């Protein structure tokens, strides 16, 4: 119901939208740093954590033109381009595995979004 | 809103109700094993994981009499004695810390609820 059953055949899902903190770090280029050259960082990042991890929202493609054009076209896949710029973490698994994965991805992503942490 | 802000001053909360699997293990005494003598296991368990962890529902006190009496009295604190027998994990913290704690407690509790796991 609201309960987790450990013996359920369904996986659980955890999803989180973490805001990229552009307000706190107005000039830091998060989107570049996270994606990496040709998207290698976020590829690696996904591979290391076992989570699906996406940069979404206004600024996510760093091509004000292309972004404008895709929104204007009305296509629902690009609907996210209107939202605040954010990292979207999605994991699935049995409860223990899912929380572990979310925790792993959450903590790796924190490292990117709080870039002057000690 | 639905977003996590890493710089929010509010902690987040994660709560989960995990069913003790009495159906799958009809004779195994989960409640005893989890609480421990004098409640030391669950004390330790909470201390090791950093989570609040409670056994709730019918069977949680293993005193069919006392349980009956407390429910019958109508006091709202004992309302849970009607629910399926379950472990209730609650954690608070900033996102990375919260998921880490939930993950830790979830996986420790799994060890108690799937007692013949390899």
Swiss-Prot record, chains A, B:
Compartments where located: Nucleus; Cytoplasm; Membrane
Residue positions where Phosphothreonine is found in the record: 41
Record note on what altering residue 99 to E does: Fails to influence alternative splicing of CD44, NRXN2 and NRXN3
Chain ranges passing through the membrane: none
Notes concerning its domains: The KH domain is required for binding to RNA.
Membership in a protein family: Belongs to the KHDRBS family.
Name of the protein in question: KH domain-containing, RNA-binding, signal transduction-associated protein 1
Species of provenance: Homo sapiens (Human)
Underlying gene: KHDRBS1
């Amino acid at each position: 119901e609201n309960y987790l059953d450990l013996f359920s055949h369904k996986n659980m899902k955890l999803k989180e939208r973490v805001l990229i903190p552009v307000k706190q770090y107005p000039k830091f280029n998060f989107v570049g740093k996270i994606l990496g050259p040709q998207g290698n960082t976020i590829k690696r990042l996904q591979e290391e954590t076992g989570a699906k991890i996406s940069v979404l929202g206004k600024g996510s493609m760093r091509d004000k033109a292309k972004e404008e054009e895709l929104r204007k076209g009305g296509d629902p896949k690009y609907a996210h381009l209107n939202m605040d710029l954010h990292v979207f973490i999605e994991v699935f698994g049995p409860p223990c595995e899912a929380y572990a994965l979310m925790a792993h991805a959450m903590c790796e992503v924190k490292k990117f979004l709080v870039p002057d942490m000690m």
